[PDB]
Design a protein around this ligand. Structure first.
Ligand SMILES: *[C@H]1O[C@H](CO[C@@H]2O[C@@H](C)[C@@H](O)[C@@H](O)[C@@H]2O)[C@@H](O)[C@H](O)[C@H]1NC(C)=O
Ligand SMILES: *[C@@H]1O[C@H](CO)[C@@H](O)[C@H](O)[C@H]1NC(C)=O
Ligand SMILES: *[C@@H]1O[C@H](CO)[C@@H](O)[C@H](O)[C@H]1NC(C)=O
Ligand SMILES: *[C@H]1O[C@H](CO)[C@@H](O)[C@H](O)[C@H]1NC(C)=O
Ligand SMILES: OC[C@@H](O)[C@H](O)[C@@H](O)CO
Ligand SMILES: OC[C@@H](O)[C@H](O)[C@@H](O)CO
Ligand SMILES: OC[C@@H](O)[C@H](O)[C@@H](O)CO
Lengths: 339, 233, 215, 175
C-alpha cells in the first residue's frame, strides 16, 4: 500500500494501450464476422497498385459485445485516474491502481457511441487540440439515451396453397427496400442531452454560436450512423439528430413536437472495411426479425474550422476511426512497469 | 474461350433437359449466372439465374415450377434444368454470366445478380422432337475443271442427312479459316437436315496442300473428318 | 410486366456513316438501368453499353448511348462491314428482365458480281443410293438472286434446295449454295447438267455445265 | 513552397507523402484552413468546401504511405494554397490554375484578327508565349491578340503559359 507523492502525467491520444486493444478487436472480428468476398488493395511494389479478391464462407452468426478486461501482466500494473472531471490529457490528481480494467463493451459504430462507460459527474468533452478542427471531439454523456432500432420479420405471408396445376404466395417482387430498418429515441431526452453538449461546448468556446449540421460527405459509413447487431450492418441517417442552432436557448419546462423521432436506416451487403483499407461483401439479410437496443453513452463530433469569420462554429458528427471508440473508455488508464 | 456450355441434343416431349456451364476463367462464386434462351430467328428471353456464393436465385414468371437453377462450386459449373418440354421450348439456350457486384456505388447483390451480363457462353440448341438422332454422312465436293475461275479453286464438303441441328464444320482443324463459307441447313422432304461447307483456295496450292473438313455433330456424338482431293481422272 | 420495342425493325446503311437505333419502353425503367447488346450472325450476344450511358470495356468510342425513362437511343459511329449484327436492348430495373424485339443492322455496298462453280456428285454418294449436284455462287452483294437448273436444256424447279449465308464481316457479300438432289436413276440417263444464274448486276445469264462421268 | 499548375476542366493531383510506410491519419485544408478532405483510419471523409463535390483520393495508396488529393472538373475559383497534416508536419503546396477563352468567332473570316483572353486568379502575374500552326512566335502579357492573319494559319494552334518556372500548353482549333 504505497503512496508516492508526485505529479502523474496522463494521455489518451498517444497511448499504446489503445492501439493494442484495437489489434484484439479486429482479431475477434475476423473469427466472428466473416465476409463472403473481400477486396483489398494489393499494394506491392511502390508503383500504383491493383485489387486483391478473396472468396470465403460467411456464416451469419451474431457478434456479441462480450465484456473485455485489459488486465495487467506479471511485472506490470495499470493506473486508474479517479478524477471526477478529467480533461483527457495532462496531469491527473487522484489516481488509484486496479489490476484489471472495467468492463468495456466492444461496439464498433460511427458518430454515436453505444453501450459504454457513463460519467458519474457531468458531461466531459475532450480533444487533443480544440483549436484544431481536424482533431475529433469525444463527448461523454451522464444520462443514458436508449436507442431502439428494429426490422420486421416473416409475418408477411403466413400460408401457401398447393394445386396440381399451380401454387400460391411465391411471386414476391415489388422492387423496394426489404433491407430497411429504423431507430427510435426519446425526443425530450435527446434534446436535453443535446443541450448539455452545448453547455460544455460554449464553456470552451464562448462568444460563438454552436450549430449542428449533417455530415459534410464521404463514405456512407461516416455519413450515416453505422453499426452491427445480429450480423447485419445498419446505416441510419443522422441528419435529423444533429439539426439545431444554439445561440440563445436556455429555459426548460415542457414542449411537445413529434412524439418520438425515427431514423431512416438501411441494411447493406457491400461494406467499406474499418479494420483495413478496402471493401467487403456479406450475405443477404436474415429471414427473421432483427431487434436491437442500446444506450447512447456518448458521441463523436468534428467542428468546422476556417479563418473566415461568421460568428457561428458548426459541429458535425465525426467518427470512423475505431481507436477513438476505445479511447473514450481507456482515457483514465495507463499501463505501467512495476517500478 | 473461358465460359463454355455442354453439347447440343434432342429430347422427346415431356422429358427434362439439363444444361451445364463450365466457368473456367477467374471467379465463379460471387458472380451470378443467368440463362437467356433464344428461339431460331426469334428474340432473346431471360429465364432466371443464381448466385453460387449465396444460393439465391431469381427467375421469370413464365417458367413457374419448370426451371431449377443449381450450382456446383467444386467444378465451378452452373446448371439449368427445364421440365415438361414442348415444341415451343426448342431454342438455343445461352448461359450468361452476370456483371457482378457494384463495389464503388451499389450496396446490394440479391436474386440472380445485378441484371446485365458481360461474359456469354457458346449456347446450346435443345431441339424438342419425337424423332431419334441421326449421324451425318459427309460427301466430298472435289475440285474440277469446271470449278476454277481464274487462279482460285473451289472445293467443299456435303454434310448430308442428320437430325437435329446444328453441325459445326471447320477446315484443317482450324488452320484454314479464310475463304470458308458454311451455308445454313435446310430441311429435306425426308425430315432430315443438310448443309454444305465450301472454301476458296489457290489452284496451284492444290497439290502442295491437303484440305480436310471436320464435321461435328454433338447430338449423335459424331465427328467425321473427310479429306477432299481432286478426282481420279 | 414491362415490354420493349425497337425501331426500326431493319436498317441497311453503308460504311463510314453513322447509325441510329431506338428502344421504346412500356413503362419507366427503375433507377434508369438499360443494357445494349450486339449479336453477329450465328454468334453469342455481346454487352455493348450498360446503365444507358456507361460504355463496356473493349467497346470502341464509336458506340454511344443516351436515354431517359422510355426514350432510349444507341448511336453507332463510323460504320464498318463487321458491324453487321442484330441489336437488342435489355432493362434490368425490374423483374422479369425483358429484352427488346431486336433490330437487324444490314450493310449496304456497291454492286458485286457472283462467280459460279458447279460440283458433280461424288463417287462415294453415287454407288450408295442417291445423287446430288451443288451450284456455288461465290461472293456478291445483291441478295436477290435466281438459280435455274437445266437437265439437258430442260428447266426444272421444285426439286432444288437453296440457302444463302449472311453478309460477310470483311466485304459485306453473300454466298449462295443451291443443291439439286435426285436419285441415281435419273442421273446417268442425262448427259447435260447445267446451272443458270440470274443476278441483278450480272450482265449475261452465266451458265456452268459439266458432263456425266467426266473429269 | 511548392508550385503546381493546372488546366481548367482537366483533373489534377496534389501529393502528400509520409516517412512511415503504414497508414496514419491525414487531413487536407486550404489557405483559410477549411476542411477539404481527410481520413478516419480506413475511411474517406469530405469537408464542407466547394471542392466537396469534385474532390477525392485514391484509398489504395493510403496503406503504402502516401495520400493523394485529386480535383476533377477543375475551375479557376479553386486556385488556392493547400496543406497536409501528417506526422505532425505541414506539407504546403500552392495551386495556381489557369484557363483560356476565345472571344473571336470559331469560324474566322479571310484576313481578320484573333482575340484570346486568359482567365487569371485575383492577384497574379501571368506570362504567355503562343505559337502559330506552322511558324510564328506570339508574345504578350495580360491579353494576347493577333491583328494581322492569313488563310495559311487555318488549323491546330499551340499556346504555352509559364508561371514560376513551370509551363503548361493549350490546343485550339481555328479555321
Ligand atoms: C495544438 O495544435 C495547435 C495548432 O495550431 C496551429 O499551429 C501552427 C501549425 C500554425 O501555423 C497554425 O496552423 C495554427 O495556429 C497548436 O498551435 C498548439 O500549440 C497545439 N497544442 C496546444 C498547446 O494547444
Ligand atoms: C449545413 O451548413 C452548411 C454550411 O456550409 C449549409 O450550406 C447547409 O445548408 C446546412 N445544412 C442544412 C441543415 O440545410
Ligand atoms: C448494447 O448492449 C446490449 C446489452 O443487453 C445488447 O443487447 C445490444 O446488442 C448492444 N448493442 C449492440 C452494439 O448491438
Ligand atoms: C418507435 O416509435 C415509432 C413512432 O414514430 C414507431 O413507428 C416504431 O414502431 C417504434 N419502434 C418500435 C418498434 O418500438
Ligand atoms: O454432353 C456433351 C459434352 O458436354 C461435350 O460437349 C464436352 O463438354 C466436350 O467434348
Ligand atoms: O487459376 C485457377 C482457375 O481460376 C480455376 O479455379 C477455374 O476458375 C475453375 O477450374
Ligand atoms: O466447339 C468446337 C468443338 O469443341 C471442337 O473443338 C471439337 O472438340 C474438336 O473438333
Amino acid at each position: 500500500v504505497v503512496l508516492e507523492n508526485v505529479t502523474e502525467h496522463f494521455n489518451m491520444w498517444k497511448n499504446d494501450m489503445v492501439e493494442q486493444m484495437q489489434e484484439d478487436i479486429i482479431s475477434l472480428w475476423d473469427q466472428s464476422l466473416k465476409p463472403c468476398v473481400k477486396l483489398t488493395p494489393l499494394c506491392v511494389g511502390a508503383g500504383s497498385c491493383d485489387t486483391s479478391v478473396i472468396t470465403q464462407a460467411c456464416p451469419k452468426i451474431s457478434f456479441e459485445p462480450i465484456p473485455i478486461h485489459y488486465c495487467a501482466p506479471a511485472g506490470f500494473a495499470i493506473l486508474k485516474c479517479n478524477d471526477k472531471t478529467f480533461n483527457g490529457k495532462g496531469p491527473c490528481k487522484n489516481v488509484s491502481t486496479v489490476q484489471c480494467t472495467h468492463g468495456i463493451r466492444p461496439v464498433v459504430s460511427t458518430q454515436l457511441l453505444l453501450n459504454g462507460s457513463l460519467a458519474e459527474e457531468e458531461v466531459v468533452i475532450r480533444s487533443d487540440n480544440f483549436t484544431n478542427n481536424a482533431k475529433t471531439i469525444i463527448v461523454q454523456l451522464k444520462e443514458s439515451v436508449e436507442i431502439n432500432c428494429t426490422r420486421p420479420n416473416q409475418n408477411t405471408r403466413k400460408s401457401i396453397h398447393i394445386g396440381p396445376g399451380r401454387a400460391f404466395y411465391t411471386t414476391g417482387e415489388i422492387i423496394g427496400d426489404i433491407r430497411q430498418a429504423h431507430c427510435n429515441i426519446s425526443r425530450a431526452k435527446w434534446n436535453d442531452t443535446l443541450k448539455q453538449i452545448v453547455i460544455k461546448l460554449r464553456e470552451q468556446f464562448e462568444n460563438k454560436t454552436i450549430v449542428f449540421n449533417h455530415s459534410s460527405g464521404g463514405d456512407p459509413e461516416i455519413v450515416m450512423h453505422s453499426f452491427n447487431c445480429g450480423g447485419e450492418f445498419f446505416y441510419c441517417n443522422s441528419a435529423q439528430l444533429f439539426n439545431s442552432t444554439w445561440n440563445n436557448n436556455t429555459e426548460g419546462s415542457n414542449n411537445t413536437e413529434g412524439n418520438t423521432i425515427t431514423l431512416p436506416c438501411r441494411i447493406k451487403q457491400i461494406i467499406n472495411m474499418w479494420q483495413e483499407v478496402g471493401k467487403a461483401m456479406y450475405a443477404p439479410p436474415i429471414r427473421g426479425q432483427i431487434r436491437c437496443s442500446s444506450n447512447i453513452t456518448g458521441l463523436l463530433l468534428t467542428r468546422d474550422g476556417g479563418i473566415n469569420e461568421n460568428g457561428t462554429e458548426i459541429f458535425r458528427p465525426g467518427g470512423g476511426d475505431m481507436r477513438d471508440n476505445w479511447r473514450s473508455e481507456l482515457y483514465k488508464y495507463k499501463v505501467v512497469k512495476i517500478e | 474461350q473461358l465460359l463454355e456450355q455442354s453439347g447440343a441434343e434432342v429430347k422427346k416431349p415431356g422429358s427434362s433437359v439439363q444444361v451445364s456451364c463450365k466457368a473456367s476463367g477467374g471467379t465463379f462464386s460471387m458472380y451470378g449466372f443467368n440463362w437467356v434462351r433464344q428461339a431460331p430467328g426469334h428474340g432473346l428471353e431471360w429465364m432466371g439465374g443464381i448466385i453460387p456464393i449465396f444460393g439465391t436465385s431469381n427467375y421469370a414468371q413464365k417458367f413457374r415450377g419448370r426451371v431449377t437453377f443449381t450450382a456446383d462450386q467444386a467444378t465451378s459449373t452452373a446448371y439449368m434444368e427445364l421440365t415438361n418440354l414442348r415444341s415451343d421450348d426448342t431454342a438455343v439456350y445461352y448461359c450468361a454470366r452476370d456483371f457482378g457486384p457494384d463495389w464503388e456505388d451499389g450496396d446490394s447483390y440479391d436474386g440472380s445478380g445485378r441484371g446485365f451480363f458481360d461474359f456469354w457462353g457458346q449456347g446450346t440448341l435443345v431441339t424438342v422432337s419425337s424423332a431419334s438422332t441421326k449421324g451425318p454422312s459427309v460427301f466430298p465436293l472435289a475440285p474440277s475443271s469446271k470449278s476454277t475461275s481464274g487462279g482460285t479453286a473451289a472445293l467443299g464438303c456435303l454434310v448430308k442427312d442428320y437430325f437435329p441441328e446444328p453441325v459445326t464444320v471447320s477446315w484443317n482443324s482450324g488452320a484454314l479459316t479464310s475463304g470458308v463459307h458454311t451455308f445454313p441447313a435446310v430441311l429435306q422432304s425426308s425430315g432430315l437436315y443438310s448443309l454444305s461447307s465450301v472454301v476458296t483456295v489457290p489452284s496451284s496450292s492444290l497439290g502442295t496442300q491437303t484440305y480436310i473438313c471436320n464435321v461435328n455433330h454433338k447430338p449423335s456424338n459424331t465427328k467425321v473428318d473427310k479429306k477432299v482431293e481432286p478426282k481420279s481422272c | 410486366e414491362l415490354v420493349l420495342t425497337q425501331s426500326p425493325g431493319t436498317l441497311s446503311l453503308s460504311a463510314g456513316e453513322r447509325a441510329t437505333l431506338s428502344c421504346r419502353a412500356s413503362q419507366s425503367v427503375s433507377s434508369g438501368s438499360l443494357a445494349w447488346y450486339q449479336q453477329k450472325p450465328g454468334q453469342a450476344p455481346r454487352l455493348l453499353i450498360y446503365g444507358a450511358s456507361t460504355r463496356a470495356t473493349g467497346i470502341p468510342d464509336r458506340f454511344s448511348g443516351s436515354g431517359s425513362g422510355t426514350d432510349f437511343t444507341l448511336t453507332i459511329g463510323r460504320l464498318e462491314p463487321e458491324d453487321l449484327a442484330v441489336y437488342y436492348c435489355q432493362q434490368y430495373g425490374t423483374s422479369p428482365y425483358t429484352f427488346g424485339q431486336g433490330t437487324k443492322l444490314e450493310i449496304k455496298r456497291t454492286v458485286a458480281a457472283p462467280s459460279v462453280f458447279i460440283f458433280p456428285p461424288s463417287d462415294e454418294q453415287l454407288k450408295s443410293g442417291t445423287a446430288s449436284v451443288v451450284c456455288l455462287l461465290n461472293n456478291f452483294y445483291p441478295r436477290e438472286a435466281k438459280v435455274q437448273w437445266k437437265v439437258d436444256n430442260a428447266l426444272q424447279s421444285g426439286n432444288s434446295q437453296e440457302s444463302v449465308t449472311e453478309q460477310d464481316s470483311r466485304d459485306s457479300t453473300y454466298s449462295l449454295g443451291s443443291t439439286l438432289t435426285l436419285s441415281k436413276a435419273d442421273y446417268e440417263k442425262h448427259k447435260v447438267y447445267a446451272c443458270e444464274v440470274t443476278h441483278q448486276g450480272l450482265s449475261s445469264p452465266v451458265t456452268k455445265s459439266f458432263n456425266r462421268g467426266e473429269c | 513552397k511548392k508550385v503546381v499548375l493546372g488546366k481548367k476542366g482537366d483533373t489534377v493531383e496534389l501529393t502528400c507523402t509520409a516517412s512511415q510506410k503504414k497508414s496514419i491519419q491525414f487531413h487536407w485544408k486550404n489557405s483559410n484552413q477549411i476542411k477539404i478532405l481527410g481520413n478516419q483510419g480506413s475511411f474517406l471523409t469530405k469537408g464542407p468546401s466547394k471542392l466537396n463535390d469534385r474532390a477525392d483520393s485514391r484509398r489504395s495508396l493510403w496503406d503504402q504511405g502516401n495520400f493523394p488529393l485529386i480535383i476533377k472538373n477543375l475551375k479557376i475559383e479553386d486556385s488556392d494554397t493547400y496543406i497536409c497534416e501528417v506526422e505532425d508536419q505541414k506539407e504546403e503546396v500552392q495551386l495556381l490554375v489557369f484557363g483560356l477563352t476565345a472571344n473571336s468567332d470559331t469560324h474566322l473570316l479571310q484576313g481578320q484578327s484573333l482575340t484570346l483572353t486568359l482567365e487569371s486568379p485575383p492577384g497574379s502575374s501571368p506570362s504567355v508565349q503562343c505559337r502559330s500552326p506552322r511558324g510564328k512566335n506570339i508574345q504578350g502579357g495580360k491579353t494576347l491578340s493577333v491583328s494581322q492573319l492569313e488563310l495559311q494559319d487555318s488549323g491546330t494552334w499551340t499556346c504555352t503559359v509559364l508561371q514560376n518556372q513551370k509551363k503548361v500548353e493549350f490546343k485550339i482549333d481555328i479555321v
